[PDB]
Amino acid sequence: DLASLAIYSFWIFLAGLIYYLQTENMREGYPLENEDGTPAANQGPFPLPKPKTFILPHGRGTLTVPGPESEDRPIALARTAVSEGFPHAPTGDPMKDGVGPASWVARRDLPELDGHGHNKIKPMKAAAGFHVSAGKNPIGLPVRGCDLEIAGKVVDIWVDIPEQMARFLEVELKDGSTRLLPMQMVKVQSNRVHVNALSSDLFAGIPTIKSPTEVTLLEEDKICGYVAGGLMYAAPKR
Amino acid sequence: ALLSFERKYRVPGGTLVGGNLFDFWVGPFYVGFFGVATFFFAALGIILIAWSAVLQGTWNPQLISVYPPALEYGLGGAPLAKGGLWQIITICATGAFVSWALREVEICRKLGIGYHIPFAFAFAILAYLTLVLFRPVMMGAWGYAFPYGIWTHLDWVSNTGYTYGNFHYNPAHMIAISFFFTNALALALHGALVLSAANPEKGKEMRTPDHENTFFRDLVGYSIGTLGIHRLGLLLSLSAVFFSALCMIITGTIWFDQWVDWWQWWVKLPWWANIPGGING
Amino acid sequence: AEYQNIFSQVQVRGPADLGMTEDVNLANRSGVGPFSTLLGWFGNAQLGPIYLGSLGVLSLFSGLMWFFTIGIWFWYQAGWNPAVFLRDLFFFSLEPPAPEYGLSFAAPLKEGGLWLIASFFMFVAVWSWWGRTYLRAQALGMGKHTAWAFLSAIWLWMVLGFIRPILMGSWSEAVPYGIFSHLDWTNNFSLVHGNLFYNPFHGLSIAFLYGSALLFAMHGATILAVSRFGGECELEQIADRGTAAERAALFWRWTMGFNATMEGIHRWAIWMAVLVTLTGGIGILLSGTVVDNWYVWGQNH
Numbered sequence: 180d181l182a183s184l185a186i187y188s189f190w191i192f193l194a195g196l197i198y199y200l201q202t203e204n205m206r207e208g209y210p211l212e213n214e215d216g217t218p219a220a221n222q223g224p225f226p227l228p229k230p231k232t233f234i235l236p237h238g239r240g241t242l243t244v245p246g247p248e249s250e251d252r253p254i255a256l257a258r259t260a261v262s263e264g265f266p267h268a269p270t271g272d273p274m275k276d277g278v279g280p281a282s283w284v285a286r287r288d289l290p291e292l293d294g295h296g297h298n299k300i301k302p303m304k305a306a307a308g309f310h311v312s313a314g315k316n317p318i319g320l321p322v323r324g325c326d327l328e329i330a331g332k333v334v335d336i337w338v339d340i341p342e343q344m345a346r347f348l349e350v351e352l353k354d355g356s357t358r359l360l361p362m363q364m365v366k367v368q369s370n371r372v373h374v375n376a377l378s379s380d381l382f383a384g385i386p387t388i389k390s391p392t393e394v395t396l397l398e399e400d401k402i403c404g405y406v407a408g409g410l411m412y413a414a415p416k417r
Numbered sequence: 418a419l420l421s422f423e424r425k426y427r428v429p430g431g432t433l434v435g436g437n438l439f440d441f442w443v444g445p446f447y448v449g450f451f452g453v454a455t456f457f458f459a460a461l462g463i464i465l466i467a468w469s470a471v472l473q474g475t476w477n478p479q480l481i482s483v484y485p486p487a488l489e490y491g492l493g494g495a496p497l498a499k500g501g502l503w504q505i506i507t508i509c510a511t512g513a514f515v516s517w518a519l520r521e522v523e524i525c526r527k528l529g530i531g532y533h534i535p536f537a538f539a540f541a542i543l544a545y546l547t548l549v550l551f552r553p554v555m556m557g558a559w560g561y562a563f564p565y566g567i568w569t570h571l572d573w574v575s576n577t578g579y580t581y582g583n584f585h586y587n588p589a590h591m592i593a594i595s596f597f598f599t600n601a602l603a604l605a606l607h608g609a610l611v612l613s614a615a616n617p618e619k620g621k622e623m624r625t626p627d628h629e630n631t632f633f634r635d636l637v638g639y640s641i642g643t644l645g646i647h648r649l650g651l652l653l654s655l656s657a658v659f660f661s662a663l664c665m666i667i668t669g670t671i672w673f674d675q676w677v678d679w680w681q682w683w684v685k686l687p688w689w690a691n692i693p694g695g696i697n698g
Numbered sequence: 699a700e701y702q703n704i705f706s707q708v709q710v711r712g713p714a715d716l717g718m719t720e721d722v723n724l725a726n727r728s729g730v731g732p733f734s735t736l737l738g739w740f741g742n743a744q745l746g747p748i749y750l751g752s753l754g755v756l757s758l759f760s761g762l763m764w765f766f767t768i769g770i771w772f773w774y775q776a777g778w779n780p781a782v783f784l785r786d787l788f789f790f791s792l793e794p795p796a797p798e799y800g801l802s803f804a805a806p807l808k809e810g811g812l813w814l815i816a817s818f819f820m821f822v823a824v825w826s827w828w829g830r831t832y833l834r835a836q837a838l839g840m841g842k843h844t845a846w847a848f849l850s851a852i853w854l855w856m857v858l859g860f861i862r863p864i865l866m867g868s869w870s871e872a873v874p875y876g877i878f879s880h881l882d883w884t885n886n887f888s889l890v891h892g893n894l895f896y897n898p899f900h901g902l903s904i905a906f907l908y909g910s911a912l913l914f915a916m917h918g919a920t921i922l923a924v925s926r927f928g929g930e931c932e933l934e935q936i937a938d939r940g941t942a943a944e945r946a947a948l949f950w951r952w953t954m955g956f957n958a959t960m961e962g963i964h965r966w967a968i969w970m971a972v973l974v975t976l977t978g979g980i981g982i983l984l985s986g987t988v989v990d991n992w993y994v995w996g997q998n999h
């Protein structure tokens with residue numbers, strides 16, 4: 180029976196497809212590890228897939244996955260129990276150390292480039308022709324933290340050129356220096372920009388960019404991780 | 418076992434209930450109070466299904482079917498073997514689903530991410546509840562709910578649909594289907610676009626979001642953008658389910674006749690109702 | 699409360715983005731269209747430019763002729779009366795030739811011929827469009843995933859109006875061009891073949907259709923949930939995994955015991971969707987050709 184053969188064959192195919200999909204999804208994060216960083220005994224029934232190499236744009240090199248995994252950064256956490264499966268307590272200030280929801284990844288310390296070789300993200304003042312086309316322009320507005328105290332003022336919008344979208348708001352602090360705030364973590368209001376994630380006193384701690392006109396992937400992660408971490412770690416001040 | 422980059426995220430906190438009492442993991446799974454709740458509800462529901470199977474006289478996965486109380490019972494209780502088990506299992510299911518969503522919320526809090534996922538899941542839960550709770554209650558009997566059986570619930574869909582003629586004529590159902598088809602279309606396109614850029618022709622450098630924008634603008638004259646496509650997929654999927662729940666909540670309540678006849682309100686508009694010619698004249 | 703990122707708070711706009719050049723024939727690319735502030739609240743505000751080479755002009759021409767052929771027929775049925783046209787718009791239908799005519803082209807224009815003409819135009823429009831999805835990717839040096847995924851949808855469409863009818867021996871087996879009529883055709887098809895709920899490929903097709911909504915709801919929500927870390931910059935996250943991708947993966951790992959990667963989730967996505975019409979087309983093609991009644995077939999298997 181043709182139909183019986185077809186359905187029988189389809190299930191064989193589907194199993195093979197699921198096998199393919201699961202292994203393809205093991206190109207990051209595997210092999211699994213014990214809490215101490217050593218290889219876990221049980222890796223599961225799916226083996227690591229054969230490595231594949233991505234040729235990065237603009238001669239940035241290549242990425243081969245699966246590949247040697249490592250955090251490449253100190254992780255300030257310590258066990259809270261004598262057996263596996265329990266939380267690991269921050270050994271210092273989690274927001275400063277970058278752990279828990281304040282975590283960041285040691286990404287490449289270079290700015291992402293668009294298909295034309297120019298920095299993908301740029302402060303609007305340096306993005307020729309870019310301007311606020313709709314909605315409340317946040318530039319010039321005071322920035323309030325969850326402690327209801329003013330933490331600074333918006334001095335610019337950082338735009339993702341290819342997507343023509345706002346990624347960050349640049350905020351100048353009382354000391355004159357600035358910090359970037361993820362657009363997704365601020366609320367633009369008629370008279371101000373409110374940041375629920377951070378109290379005014381934590382703005383100075385937001386990781387700074389080394390060059391005022393650009394932001395690297397590494398800096399992006401440190402900035403976004405720090406702000407997001409505030410939801411949990413700044414709760415006492417909220 | 419943990420993913421190579423996982424330990425830094427396994428910190429204390431984020432729980433909604435119980436403090437640190439259930440703040441831990443079992444293998445890859447996070448537990449939490451709602452993990453315990455989900456396990457309880459799921460285990461009990463599964464045990465009761467197995468018991469319903471015994472009362473039914475079969476262990477065949479294809480035959481096991483738990484039915485809600487017959488219409489005679491209205492919205493009241495019923496003997497375990499005559500609809501009572503379905504009632505309890507339904508409570509367990511609801512408890513397990515809601516607990517699952519709340520567990521996701523705790524996970525969101527520990528990871529410092531948005532709550533979009535459980536919010537989205539809540540739509541599926543509300544669709545389920547529309548069929549086993551809201552619609553049955555509005556109609557006056559648990560018997561209008563679908564049975565828990567692999568094939569028997571399909572009998573219910575078929576029988577329920579034909580109760581109103583060809584169910585295709587339910588206007589809310591048409592909208593729901595449009596969103597389901599459009600969603601699958603958008604999902605295929607999204608997956609294909611990202612992959613076509615990450616996996617260009619052999620030997621070439623990975624393509625960029627600019628290439629993604631360019632491909633679709635060249636193709637159809639528009640590119641919704643990366644943020645836009647994920648907002649779209651979420652909206653299409655949730656809209657499909659919203660209209661699904663809507664098409665059923667109005668069926669057997671505000672509208673109970675043949676759905677095809679509903680469309681006469683349009684054909685009967687005074688300004689063209691009696692104009693000769695066409696299909697309806 | 700907090701910003702959910704469903705609609706943008708502020709829109710920014712720059713010079714019209716003319717896109718990548720690569721191997722594209724810029725001569726066939728139009729100028730940029732207008733900008734829609736309305737659309738800009740949800741996605742990109744920019745319309746165009748669009749690419750229109752010979753193949754594209756052919757596809758649009760055929761597609762329009764397909765649309766117009768059906769439409770001219772609708773006006774006819776309406777007695778060329780505008781009011782009737784709108785009144786019975788959903789009731790009009792361009793039906794295929796009667797069984798009598800089999801696979802011939804001798805059927806009168808008003809009794810099948812026009813349906814065949816319209817179908818020919820649709821055939822050309824769809825296949826030329828497919829070539830276009832392939833060629834637009836090739837000119838940009840991109841993979842051909844879009845063309846291959848599109849082929850899956852084309853498969854069900856081909857099965858419905860061309861392959862199955864041919865194997866069945868008559869154009870009468872095909873789908874009519876009409877809003878209500880194609881719905882009636884769908885219901886009838888199930889009734890005639892013993893209830894499609896008994897067709898295993900229909901059950902699978904449904905699993906993938908529901909699954910596509912499950913998965914896009916999961917993926918869309920996940921990306922929005924981690925957009926605060928630039929999670930939507932998917933290609934960037936594939937090339938250099940960030941905390942957005944790690945948290946996305948851990949949300950799911952902690953929730954259901956396993957997870958994906960930023961690249962891998964899009965493979966789950968493309969297959970979940972593609973399988974809808976792949977299994978669907980098989981289910982339909984087997985109906986009437988190999989299996990006359992699914993309930994009956996299920997009793998024997």
Ligand code: BCL
Nearest residue numbers: 541542544545574575577578583584585593594661662665
């Ligand atoms: C002859 C039958 C009638 C008909 C009768 C009906 C009836 C009757 C109904 C539909 C419904 C639907 N119909 Mg109809 N329908 C017909 C023909 C069609 C056609 C077609 C091509 O012809 C299409 C595309 C549709 C499409 C649809 C969808 C819009 C909708 C189903 C999705 C939904 O509600 O999900 C909602 C999602 C859920 C219910 C899932 C909830 C999931 C829960 C929260 C979690 C489960 C967890 C699980 C237990 C754990 C498992 C274990 C783990 C895996 C480990 N119908 C014909 C004409 N249709 C249904 C609807 O709108 O329902 C509201 C409905 O009731």
Ligand code: BCL
Nearest residue numbers: 463545563567568570574900901902904905906908909912
């Ligand atoms: C949605 C509108 C109608 C309906 C109409 C249909 C139609 C029509 C069909 C199905 C089909 C299925 N339906 Mg149903 N179904 C309804 C409500 C449900 C509910 C529910 C609690 O609300 C559940 C759990 C299911 C479950 C199922 C699966 C048995 C099957 C594949 C679905 C799928 O892959 O989805 C997408 C989800 C995923 C891919 C994720 C994985 C989900 C797994 C596979 C679900 C397993 C559930 C398990 C068997 C039951 C509980 C297990 C234990 C008791 C804990 N249906 C309502 C009443 N359903 C198809 C089938 O083949 O039936 C035989 C089919 O043709």
Ligand code: BCL
Nearest residue numbers: 851852855884885887888894900903904907978979981982
């Ligand atoms: C009474 C009705 C019968 C029934 C009869 C059928 C029949 C008959 C069929 C389905 C099919 C399907 N049904 Mg069923 N079905 C029933 C009950 C259901 C229920 C339910 C909850 O009860 C559900 C959820 C479904 C769900 C589904 C889908 C999984 C599947 C369609 C996939 C698809 O994406 O097609 C939509 C996608 C396409 C048609 C591809 C189109 C591609 C082309 C190339 C597009 C051209 C566009 C054109 C040029 C116009 C452009 C215009 C623009 C302006 C540019 N059915 C009942 C039992 N069902 C199909 C199937 O695959 O079965 C196995 C099918 O043939």
Ligand SMILES: CC[C@H]1c2cc3[nH]c4c(c3C)C(=O)[C@H](C(=O)OC)c4c3nc(cc4[nH]c(cc(n2)[C@@H]1C)c(C(C)=O)c4C)[C@@H](C)[C@@H]3CCC(=O)OC/C=C(\C)CCC[C@@H](C)CCC[C@@H](C)CCCC(C)C
Nearest residue numbers: 459462509510513517537538540541566567908911912915
């Ligand atoms: C709102 C739109 C779509 C959507 C979204 C969605 N679903 C979701 C989520 C989201 C965002 C999750 O986060 C959650 C998830 O974790 O996914 C992996 C989930 C999920 N969607 C699931 C299934 C599912 N979703 C579906 C649909 C949809 N989900 C929509 C299309 C369908 C169908 C039929 O279309 C199914 C079958 C689960 C895999 C998962 C939620 C897991 C969960 O709640 O676990 C707790 C419970 C158990 C493990 C056991 C319950 C056992 C008993 C207590 C009850 C069962 C009795 C009875 C109800 C069974 C009836 C069976 C018969 C009908 C055959």
Ligand SMILES: COC(C)(C)C/C=C/C(C)=C/C=C/C(C)=C/C=C/C(C)=C\C=C\C=C(C)\C=C\C=C(/C)CC/C=C(\C)CCC=C(C)C
Nearest residue numbers: 768769770817818821855856858859860873875876877880
């Ligand atoms: C009032 O304004 C004017 C312009 C008149 C516009 C009016 C137009 C209107 C109102 C148009 C409405 C069109 C509609 C409603 C179309 C609806 C189509 C529907 C609802 C469903 C479509 C199903 C069609 C399928 C499955 C078609 C499959 C077709 C094929 C597989 C191709 C088959 C090709 C064949 C048989 C030709 C073979 C010939 C050769 C030589 C190769």
Ligand SMILES: CCCCCCCCCCCC[N+](C)(C)[O-]
Nearest residue numbers: 197201222223224225445955956
């Ligand atoms: C409906 C099928 C989709 C489910 C696919 C399930 C894949 C199970 C993967 C388990 C991998 C576990 N782990 C951590 C050991 O890698």
Ligand SMILES: CCCCCCCCCCCC[N+](C)(C)[O-]
Nearest residue numbers: 898899901902905909966969970
């Ligand atoms: C990548 C695709 C993984 C999805 C696997 C979906 C499995 C659900 C199968 C359910 C329907 C089975 N059937 C034939 C009895 O209808």
Ligand SMILES: [Fe+2]
Nearest residue numbers: 607917921932
């Ligand atoms: Fe994505």
